[PDB]
Point group: D3
Chain length 296, copies 6
């Protein structure tokens, strides 16, 4: 009687989604979507469910950008200012975790008894990946390549795998695509690492102190030289430190090593793609295109 509970208003949603709406208004390379499209060539998910899945994955992806940019302490995002440099850390963080749960509500629309478990297991894999990455960063402990790949499997596989698993759960065909999906996420992340250092901020991964795939190679290629790992500790904003690091990683042949690893991995994926097709699946051009987009 003294307290009268009010309904939630459009204006309040608008406030809560400010950081989220901002990010969504920035053009990006929409690739989770193309990945969904080219797996749908095989899975043929009914349209009403595919739209639900696409919206769930868009939401989760954007929400996790809000959070990752805060936790990585990035400065740019699709070339425009990072969401929390407009709205502040707290509202960006909370906006993104809010969207995690709007997405779960959206997922409930599949009215599929397995969809909740699929969502939970992905979000758990997500944070498990991002947690091991923060652990190495904060401890200055360089992982092995193998350790890095298991982490990437979790933390970039998480949403890749989430999308395809939901599609699988809504489709009639019972082929297991997840191993291939996980490969593509690993390739995607390794390419990302490479492009962050070699492509037209300058090497934001160095500023953030991240043990990325080529940085790992360079540090371990000659553990007697501690210049690179010490640069990571400094978390350098300066272009002159970054340019020096870049140059040292050239001397260790680490960009050549990464290119050859991506080559080896694309070859496994094509081989795998051909396996599924030699077993009664339509030839998939769209997925070969996706895999060509990653190349460097």
């Amino acid at each position: 009687s003294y307290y009268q509970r009010s309904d939630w208003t459009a204006d309040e949603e608008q406030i809560l989604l400010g950081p989220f709406d901002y990010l969504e208004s920035l053009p990006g390379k929409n690739m989770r979507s193309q990945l969904i499209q080219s797996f749908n060539t095989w899975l043929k998910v009914p349209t009403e469910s595919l739209d639900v899945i696409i919206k769930v994955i868009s939401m989760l992806h954007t929400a996790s950008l809000l959070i990752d940019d805060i936790q990585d302490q990035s400065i740019l995002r699709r070339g425009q200012p990072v969401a929390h440099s407009i709205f502040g850390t707290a509202q960006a963080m909370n906006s993104g975790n809010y969207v995690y749960f709007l997405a779960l509500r959206e997922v409930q629309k599949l009215q599929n008894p397995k969809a909740i478990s699929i969502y939970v297991d992905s979000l758990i894999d997500l944070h498990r990946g991002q947690g091991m990455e923060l652990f190495w960063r904060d401890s200055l402990m360089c992982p092995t390549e193998e350790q890095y790949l298991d982490m990437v499997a979790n933390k970039t596989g998480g949403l890749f795998c989430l999308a395809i698993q939901l599609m699988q759960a809504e489709a009639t065909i019972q082929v297991d695509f997840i191993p291939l999906v996980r490969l593509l996420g690993i390739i995607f992340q390794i390419c990302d690492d490479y492009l962050n250092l070699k492509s037209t901020g300058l090497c934001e991964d160095l500023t953030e102190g991240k043990f990325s795939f080529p940085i790992i190679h360079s540090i371990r290629s000659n553990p007697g030289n501690r210049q690179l790992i010490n640069i990571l500790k400094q978390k350098p904003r300066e272009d002159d430190i970054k340019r020096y690091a870049l140059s040292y990683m050239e001397s260790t042949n680490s960009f050549e090593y990464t290119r050859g690893v991506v080559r080896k991995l694309k070859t496994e994926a094509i081989d795998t793609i051909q396996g599924l097709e030699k077993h009664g699946l339509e030839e998939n051009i769209g997925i070969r295109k996706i895999l060509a987009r990653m190349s460097l």
Copy 2:
């Protein structure tokens, strides 16, 4: 194959849970699990289900402390360092949101279909309340008391309501206890606001007037700001996020001049009366007299 997927190990769980386990080992008031037990006098949920519910609510509560101490830039927690000042904010944040989803997995063990929707709706309300509170905070706009209470109902209420709705989902009695529990969450939050400013117990556990340092528009702060809009001293103090004891001291003195601490006591007094009436009303409809719930209401007092 080049990639050889591996199993998650206990050593890795331990890393992921470091911040959470740190917080979990500092002693707390356990209001929430005592509130559950008082309601279980009426709802009589079996032990197996009730352990799950208690575990889910305490996972979610610790998790959100992890996150809220970061977003509030708090310094102490249970009179000990905030988790993120040991582990850093990134890992403290990630561990906290990780646990949100460990708790979702945990509530699946009820194999109750209403349970997922209850969980979803409550996490949503949590973030809605927290989101409006940060909005006023960052914009320097003082809410009305009514707006404050709507937000508290979502933020603090959302987790009280989650605990009792899960119990209701696990019980066959068709009484709605949620209004009562929501009322208790408001009373609890207003008491918390008052104590953040007026007690050596909380001033030893979170700092002298940490709500001032954070710039939070709490219940007595709102009252004192709005009771004399021509004086901007208090809201300017909030803008400054003072760590100094002298500013906080002056602000506290100012709020006594506005009779705001008395105003709050009076409000809490009216709400607790409403709470007792509600309890007595439920009991006048077949329920046994509930001493535990009277004792938890009591232990929210000044």
Copy 3:
């Protein structure tokens, strides 16, 4: 006997006027002066007094730059470093307030019983304007256009009006020019706001968190979007935040809105100028030129 009061020396003046002499040595757009010249076409102030007034207004103008640059936390001034980044905050502040009172001593040379009251009322209007502007800035409270204009009347009218009022007090003609003078100061300030965002630091008003005329328009044009007002709170030094804000203000048509307001205001001034001339005043080319200088 133990204390012997010493005279004030040229060397000490030189110290006290260091920040002031520095600013005066930087070329600027000298417009208070042209405004005085083109009103003198009508007022014909005797030369000895006009020189006193010109010196008083030069002093006050430069002194208030010393102070405004500190209070706004600017970084550049006429392209060169801001006075307090050479001399420090305290000496720049004190140098400027010192000059306020040297000017009052200079004003006493008019030996006009009204001149002191005119000076006091202007300096009061000055600080009243700058105080409401700090109040909105520090409180994140966006004023209305109407509120902003009353503030500008006070805080840019103050020295405009001061100059013309002294001239009026020293002249024989009794025409009231102040309403027109105040209009011109409002036009001058709105143009300044526009030029601060669209012209060749980049949008120093965003860094300073100022509710300027186009920013006000943009914020209020769509109060459901809080991106701009939140950028103001951040007080951004980064060019990427400023560029984004700039772009958002384009989308709200706020530069088009400001241009049309300045158009409307120039038309009132010409109309007013023509009124005074249709009542026995020389046709004033110089003031029409001044008003053309503001255009955008």
Copy 4:
């Protein structure tokens, strides 16, 4: 018309005066209005004029505290937060200079033509003294004692001299009291310098040795620096602007080793003797014996 000029409102005055009103409500020593009253025994200015003078001098004094606390980067004021740490420096600064001109308007009410020139010359001296003090401060050059006293005569003296010159302008007696009042302002400032370092009353009101934190070349600091130029410890401490109590403590200890606090007492002793002689001299020329002025001199003592 598009522009519709509006009147200044009381709500707006209140904003403009927030910092000033804040300071004005913290209790002070009221040396200045007591000094005026002692001189009024001799000058016998009518109440109406004397209220104006007292109001002008207290407006100007509060205003310049607002400004000086910013320029000195002070932390406390009358044992309370500095105005700018509630209101921010911009508004605190603007409000302070605003009041300078409210006071100019206020002194116009004497309708005394000498009054404007007196006001102008004193504000000029104020800024000249403050300006030399910042110059030594920022350049790390220690003045001589003589230069220090010239600057104090302008800075602290300028506002004592303003109060008594306005009274002289409102009186027909043709005695010059300004030399005496200037002497009193020096004594007052030297006492202030000593007490900033040597008293729990001022160390509770402005902090432990706040003059050190600010880097001010005060009277005992100058003496101690110059008495042994081969030791640069003290002047290097000034350069550092220490907030830590340990540095300030060490510096205080150093200045005792230089007998600087004794040196100051001795100087203050000589000046107060000169002050009494001057008073007795004025009284030996027709003026009634002035007990009040003897009591204010007394209450400047250690």
Copy 5:
């Protein structure tokens, strides 16, 4: 000629030595010059040579405090400000390395050719130990206890060993005392590590647990970190370099739970027993019983 070379003056020495002289005037424990005197019972170095040795070792010790307080970012030293917080780091650093070479010049006065090589080898060991300690520090890698003891032998041991090797070079007795003195330097450093955390005497002289603020992997810290690798709380605290007393307090509490302070006492106990055996062994070979050396061993104790 345009350039007219000039002589170095006492005024300039005084500047160069300001930081050094500041430190030199704060009272210390004088362990090192007492250790020299105890060994001189056996080595019986003439007074003239022994004064030189004592002067060289105390120059080098003060110099390296100057430098180590900067590199460790220490706050207090002998319960007084660190030299560089008066003089700034540049001058404090330069003065300290200056003195390293004044001491080299000073040791030349022995006109002993072994002396230069002894000096060189010890300064080398100093920097080797300090260098490994910063390496672990900055990399966040906890050494093993064995690696810690190797580093301590170089860093703290290097200056004990320097003092006694110079004495050996000035004596004709052909006994090797260096193993014993190195052992004493380890015991001394482990005691220092323990006391940095567990005594109001050292907590009043260097701060509450200043080793935590600095991130140093000291003896009990290493033990406590390594005794439970699954808990990363302590090493994460080191990473944070906490100045707050609450974090340091929690970390201290954590290390008690790991029984690390007991572990250290036990280690120090074993080393002191080894030290006594060594002494007794040397004495069983012609040397007179040495009470002084037993008393300095004693005064390293808890």
Copy 6:
């Protein structure tokens, strides 16, 4: 028995010399070496000793760069990032002071009874010079030209003189070259000061607050203007402050004054060089080349 002293390993040397090895891997203008070569035309030091001396001087020079960059708070070094911005202050400092003593061990290889005294006296002169320079900087006390030159004699003469003195101590000829060596170091330092402000970071000496030769001239040329010395106090990172200072030093004719001083000093050196040659020394082309390299 409980403690077992371990030997020092290559891996540990590698750690301790990390900052040092880094610096040595950056190309620099190798001039201490050319100075040694062209004095060896006269001194003809036996090869085995000349190599020892060269290594000692290389070590000391690089080590003192590690330290000076920390104490000056520089940011660049031979165009690449400064050593302590990779390794941190403490390890760079300690790496450099370690090398001081490795060099002393190296010097012992000359097995020359005088070499230790020569080393000590140079290192003392070094720190005496750098100490007076920090004293003026930290006290804002502008030295006289004459004071500055005595300081430079110590702090840039120190290693110049050290090199030639060791060569002298290892050579058979007994000519005293030190006065000429000291002249060349003074010329070298004055040229350095000039080039730091006029040459293609921008005026790092202003950022560091250094009283260099032209800055000294400018400040003292008109002590009534305190703009330059106040810029020094600010230690400006901004290019706009530096550009303004640069311009003010132009107006004081201070770069013209420095060029004329260097002219006067080169003329003394040539005159001195010709003296030594008119007394039985080979004509030295190499040293005239060195002296031409300094020119501006």
